[PDB]
Amino acid sequence: MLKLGVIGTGAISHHFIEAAHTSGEYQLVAIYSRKLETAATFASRYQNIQLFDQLEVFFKSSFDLVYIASPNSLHFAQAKAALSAGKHVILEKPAVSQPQEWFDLIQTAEKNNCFIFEAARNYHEKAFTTIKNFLADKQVLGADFNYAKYSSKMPDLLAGQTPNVFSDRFAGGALMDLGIYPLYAAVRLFGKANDATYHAQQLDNSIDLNGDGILFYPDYQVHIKAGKNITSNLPCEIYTTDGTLTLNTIEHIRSAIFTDHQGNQVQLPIQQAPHTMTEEVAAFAHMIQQPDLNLYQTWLYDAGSVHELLYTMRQTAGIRFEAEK
Amino acid sequence: AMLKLGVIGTGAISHHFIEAAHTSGEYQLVAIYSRKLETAATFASRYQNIQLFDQLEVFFKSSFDLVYIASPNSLHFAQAKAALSAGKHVILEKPAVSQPQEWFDLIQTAEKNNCFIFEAARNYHEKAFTTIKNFLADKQVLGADFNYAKYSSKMPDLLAGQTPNVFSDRFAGGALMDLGIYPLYAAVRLFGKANDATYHAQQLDNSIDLNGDGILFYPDYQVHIKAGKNITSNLPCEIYTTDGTLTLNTIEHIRSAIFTDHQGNQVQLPIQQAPHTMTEEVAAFAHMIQQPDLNLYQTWLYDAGSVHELLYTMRQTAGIRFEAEK
Ligand SMILES: NC(=O)c1ccc[n+]([C@@H]2O[C@H](COP(=O)([O-])OP(=O)(O)OC[C@H]3O[C@@H](n4cnc5c(N)ncnc54)[C@H](OP(=O)(O)O)[C@@H]3O)[C@@H](O)[C@H]2O)c1
Ligand SMILES: NC(=O)c1ccc[n+]([C@@H]2O[C@H](COP(=O)([O-])OP(=O)(O)OC[C@H]3O[C@@H](n4cnc5c(N)ncnc54)[C@H](OP(=O)(O)O)[C@@H]3O)[C@@H](O)[C@H]2O)c1
């Protein structure tokens, strides 16, 4: 039974803990916050939880694993300290702001004999295994993936504030916050791309409100759309020589249907999970309990591929964070 | 009084045009040109009392008011120029030309011979676009996503090692030129000319694009464009505004247009899809000739120029080069 520490008192932390408890494989025991009162307010719905407003003291406590859902810009430093203190780390997406940070995390992890995982919830969905198997004997000719929805932080932005998710100080933007999902889907299904491009509508601080990119593969390309000031409801498509696979989304996928060039249809057996994080939560605890180091190596590798793509795409669009300026 | 119609091109598309022309009550087919008189004969046989021709010079000397031209893309320019110099009005199938200077050249020739020239951009003329543009008139647009990608009937020939005209660098083929022009025309119709454009394609050895993705850049937003001929997409087309998303089932022969706001309220736009894809353009062209609104005609010419400029810019970024350009 895994002892769970948590950083970040956002709603997402509640969602993770709720999935972790439900799996029957974790037990929350500790919470860190910048303020004790915020930790208390967060923890009040739970029972017997140690509270911390000092990261140093937090990491010296007895737990096995820490879920980190702080702002993007803080992920690296907090995760590195967690690993140095011999804790396993589940790190919310996007795990890092630069590919080198990911490689440094891995080294730090190996040194301290701990697992580091990016909480790429869509990547672990059983749907993707079903979809990849289906395409195994097919020849892919292209794809079109998106994730664009109108942020709850839009009113604050429009009123002249700069919410963390739209700030260059906190490594935000549509590509970082949402575009990472279709990138993870592409890597899951197609592996590492050859190259990538991205162009975005940007705020004055260079952060992207929305954008369009392409991932380049040997005999095809994948259009990527990300957006936070717009709502898209476009399905996601994968083209093959014999037809088109239509996925309703590339996250928390609920249907996958193949149509051939004569209009004959095949419904892939998709069984959406009750919650968005159910499958990653099971996968992570399964890995720590019964290590498949080969599977672990691919998770690390695919995360590396995603963050290389993100970084290339930010560079082409001119999306620059404060520490890069 | 009926417009006497001559036709170049004996493909299925010419039969479809003629059918719409006759159904409108505004045209009467009188002449058909073909490279071979026998090809003209087979094509003409379903009609009545049609003159057949196998020489363009002789064709253009006969009595008809206007010519519909549906030859391969690379032949559009020279044939249309000859028609206009012969004093015939021209409906030229899309894509009208291979480079914007050709379009300007046709317009100059048309004006000096006091004739109309129309690009047969069937979607641009759909009443749906008037309804959509009126609805967007007091919204603030934040971007759009348009596509036209359908698996070509010429794919089996292609895959068998042949090279159909639509996939040939000698006939100005490719997904962008053949299908991509529809979303471009839709974008120009609603938003006007973009400030810049890019396109990246999957290409045959002759540089012709099987499919591709591009972006039209406007001052405060961008429009994703997808075109394809070796793939089939059924993605809807979206226009984003500050207050919601307008969803069109397509940007050609549009059937439905629904606006959904950020609170989930829906507004259905009144779209009345024509019985046929060409109904609306055929009525518009006849109406322009018989009861001209010349200012509107000029807008049609300008917008076509905008479309072909974007097309040409996009071919250049993707490296799509025709035989004449190599
Ligand atoms: N997998 C998913 O479906 C999912 C959904 C949402 C987001 N995520 C990710 O989870 C992470 C957090 O999301 P979020 O929207 O909750 O971010 P956030 O609200 O900006 O920050 C999250 C937590 O970090 C702390 N924090 C806020 N501002 C800070 C600052 N200036 N300096 C240090 N700490 C600060 C706060 O906790 P304290 O007040 O207790 O210090 C806050 O509760 C992001 O990386 C995001 O990408 C994943
Ligand atoms: N608006 C629409 O919805 C619609 C749909 C389809 C096509 N179009 C357009 O219509 C035009 C033709 O399409 P298509 O598929 O029918 O093209 P196509 O088959 O390649 O050629 C059409 C006609 O042009 C002639 N032709 C063929 N090869 C030729 C050559 N090497 N040299 C000179 N003439 C040749 C043939 O007529 P002859 O044998 O009698 O000479 C043929 O019937 C294209 O510009 C296309 O973009 C638009």
CSV table of N, CA and C in Angstrom, one decimal, chain B residues 244-295:
chain,number,residue,atom,x,y,z
B,244,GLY,N,-18.0,32.1,-28.8
B,244,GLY,CA,-18.3,30.7,-29.2
B,244,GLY,C,-17.7,30.1,-30.4
B,245,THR,N,-18.3,29.1,-30.9
B,245,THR,CA,-17.8,28.4,-32.1
B,245,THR,C,-19.0,28.2,-33.2
B,246,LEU,N,-18.7,28.7,-34.4
B,246,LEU,CA,-19.7,28.3,-35.5
B,246,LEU,C,-19.2,27.1,-36.2
B,247,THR,N,-20.0,26.1,-36.3
B,247,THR,CA,-19.7,24.8,-36.9
B,247,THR,C,-20.5,24.6,-38.2
B,248,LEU,N,-19.7,24.5,-39.3
B,248,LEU,CA,-20.3,24.2,-40.6
B,248,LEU,C,-20.0,22.7,-41.0
B,249,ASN,N,-20.9,22.0,-41.5
B,249,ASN,CA,-20.7,20.6,-41.8
B,249,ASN,C,-19.5,20.5,-42.8
B,250,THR,N,-19.5,21.4,-43.8
B,250,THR,CA,-18.4,21.5,-44.8
B,250,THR,C,-18.2,23.0,-45.2
B,251,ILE,N,-17.3,23.3,-46.1
B,251,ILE,CA,-17.3,24.6,-46.7
B,251,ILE,C,-17.6,24.6,-48.1
B,252,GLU,N,-18.2,23.5,-48.6
B,252,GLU,CA,-18.7,23.3,-50.0
B,252,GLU,C,-20.0,22.6,-50.0
B,253,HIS,N,-20.9,23.1,-50.8
B,253,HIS,CA,-22.3,22.6,-50.8
B,253,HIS,C,-22.8,22.4,-49.4
B,254,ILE,N,-22.7,23.5,-48.6
B,254,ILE,CA,-22.9,23.6,-47.2
B,254,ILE,C,-24.4,23.2,-46.8
B,255,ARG,N,-24.5,22.3,-45.9
B,255,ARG,CA,-25.8,21.8,-45.5
B,255,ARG,C,-26.3,22.4,-44.1
B,256,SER,N,-25.3,22.6,-43.2
B,256,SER,CA,-25.7,23.1,-41.9
B,256,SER,C,-24.7,24.1,-41.3
B,257,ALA,N,-25.2,25.0,-40.5
B,257,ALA,CA,-24.3,26.0,-39.8
B,257,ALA,C,-24.9,26.3,-38.5
B,258,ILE,N,-24.2,25.9,-37.4
B,258,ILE,CA,-24.7,26.0,-36.1
B,258,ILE,C,-23.7,26.7,-35.2
B,259,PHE,N,-24.2,27.8,-34.5
B,259,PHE,CA,-23.3,28.6,-33.6
B,259,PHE,C,-23.6,28.1,-32.1
B,260,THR,N,-22.5,27.7,-31.4
B,260,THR,CA,-22.7,27.3,-30.0
B,260,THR,C,-21.9,28.3,-29.1
B,261,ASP,N,-22.5,28.9,-28.1
B,261,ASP,CA,-21.8,29.9,-27.3
B,261,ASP,C,-21.1,29.2,-26.1
B,262,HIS,N,-20.4,29.9,-25.3
B,262,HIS,CA,-19.6,29.3,-24.2
B,262,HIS,C,-20.5,28.9,-23.0
B,263,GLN,N,-21.8,29.2,-23.1
B,263,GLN,CA,-22.7,28.6,-22.1
B,263,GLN,C,-23.5,27.5,-22.8
B,264,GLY,N,-23.2,27.1,-24.0
B,264,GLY,CA,-23.9,26.0,-24.6
B,264,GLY,C,-25.2,26.3,-25.3
B,265,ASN,N,-25.5,27.6,-25.4
B,265,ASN,CA,-26.7,27.9,-26.2
B,265,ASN,C,-26.4,27.7,-27.7
B,266,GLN,N,-27.4,27.3,-28.5
B,266,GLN,CA,-27.1,27.0,-29.9
B,266,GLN,C,-28.0,27.9,-30.7
B,267,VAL,N,-27.4,28.4,-31.8
B,267,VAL,CA,-28.2,29.2,-32.8
B,267,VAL,C,-28.0,28.5,-34.1
B,268,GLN,N,-29.1,28.0,-34.7
B,268,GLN,CA,-29.1,27.4,-36.0
B,268,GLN,C,-29.3,28.4,-37.1
B,269,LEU,N,-28.3,28.5,-38.0
B,269,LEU,CA,-28.4,29.5,-39.1
B,269,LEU,C,-29.2,28.9,-40.2
B,270,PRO,N,-30.1,29.7,-40.9
B,270,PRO,CA,-30.9,29.1,-41.9
B,270,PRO,C,-30.1,28.8,-43.2
B,271,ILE,N,-29.8,27.6,-43.4
B,271,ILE,CA,-29.1,27.1,-44.6
B,271,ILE,C,-30.0,26.3,-45.5
B,272,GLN,N,-30.2,26.7,-46.7
B,272,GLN,CA,-31.0,26.0,-47.7
B,272,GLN,C,-30.2,25.4,-48.8
B,273,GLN,N,-29.6,24.2,-48.6
B,273,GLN,CA,-28.7,23.6,-49.5
B,273,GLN,C,-29.3,23.4,-50.9
B,274,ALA,N,-28.6,23.7,-51.9
B,274,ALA,CA,-29.2,23.6,-53.3
B,274,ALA,C,-29.3,22.2,-53.7
B,275,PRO,N,-30.2,21.8,-54.6
B,275,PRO,CA,-30.3,20.5,-55.1
B,275,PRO,C,-29.0,20.0,-55.7
B,276,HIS,N,-28.2,20.9,-56.2
B,276,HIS,CA,-27.0,20.5,-56.8
B,276,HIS,C,-25.8,21.4,-56.5
B,277,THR,N,-24.6,20.9,-56.6
B,277,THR,CA,-23.4,21.7,-56.2
B,277,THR,C,-23.2,23.0,-57.0
B,278,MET,N,-23.7,23.0,-58.3
B,278,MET,CA,-23.5,24.1,-59.2
B,278,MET,C,-24.6,25.0,-59.4
B,279,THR,N,-25.8,24.7,-58.8
B,279,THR,CA,-27.0,25.4,-59.0
B,279,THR,C,-26.8,26.9,-58.8
B,280,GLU,N,-26.2,27.3,-57.7
B,280,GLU,CA,-26.1,28.7,-57.3
B,280,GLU,C,-25.1,29.5,-58.2
B,281,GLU,N,-23.9,29.0,-58.5
B,281,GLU,CA,-23.0,29.7,-59.4
B,281,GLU,C,-23.6,29.8,-60.8
B,282,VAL,N,-24.3,28.8,-61.3
B,282,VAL,CA,-24.9,28.9,-62.6
B,282,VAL,C,-26.0,30.0,-62.7
B,283,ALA,N,-26.7,30.1,-61.6
B,283,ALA,CA,-27.7,31.2,-61.6
B,283,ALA,C,-27.0,32.6,-61.5
B,284,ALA,N,-26.0,32.7,-60.7
B,284,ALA,CA,-25.3,33.9,-60.5
B,284,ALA,C,-24.6,34.4,-61.8
B,285,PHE,N,-24.0,33.5,-62.5
B,285,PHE,CA,-23.3,33.9,-63.8
B,285,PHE,C,-24.3,34.4,-64.8
B,286,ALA,N,-25.4,33.7,-64.9
B,286,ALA,CA,-26.4,34.1,-65.9
B,286,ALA,C,-27.0,35.4,-65.5
B,287,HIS,N,-27.3,35.6,-64.2
B,287,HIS,CA,-27.8,36.9,-63.7
B,287,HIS,C,-26.8,38.0,-63.9
B,288,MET,N,-25.5,37.7,-63.7
B,288,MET,CA,-24.5,38.8,-64.0
B,288,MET,C,-24.5,39.2,-65.4
B,289,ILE,N,-24.6,38.3,-66.4
B,289,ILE,CA,-24.6,38.6,-67.8
B,289,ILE,C,-25.8,39.4,-68.2
B,290,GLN,N,-27.0,38.9,-67.7
B,290,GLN,CA,-28.3,39.5,-68.1
B,290,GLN,C,-28.6,40.8,-67.4
B,291,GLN,N,-28.3,40.9,-66.1
B,291,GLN,CA,-28.6,42.1,-65.3
B,291,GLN,C,-27.3,42.4,-64.4
B,292,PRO,N,-26.3,42.9,-65.0
B,292,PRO,CA,-25.0,43.1,-64.3
B,292,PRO,C,-25.0,44.0,-63.1
B,293,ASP,N,-24.3,43.6,-62.1
B,293,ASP,CA,-23.9,44.5,-61.0
B,293,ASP,C,-22.4,44.5,-61.2
B,294,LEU,N,-21.8,45.5,-61.8
B,294,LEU,CA,-20.4,45.4,-62.2
B,294,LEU,C,-19.5,45.6,-61.0
B,295,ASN,N,-20.0,46.2,-60.0
B,295,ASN,CA,-19.1,46.4,-58.7
B,295,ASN,C,-19.0,45.0,-58.1
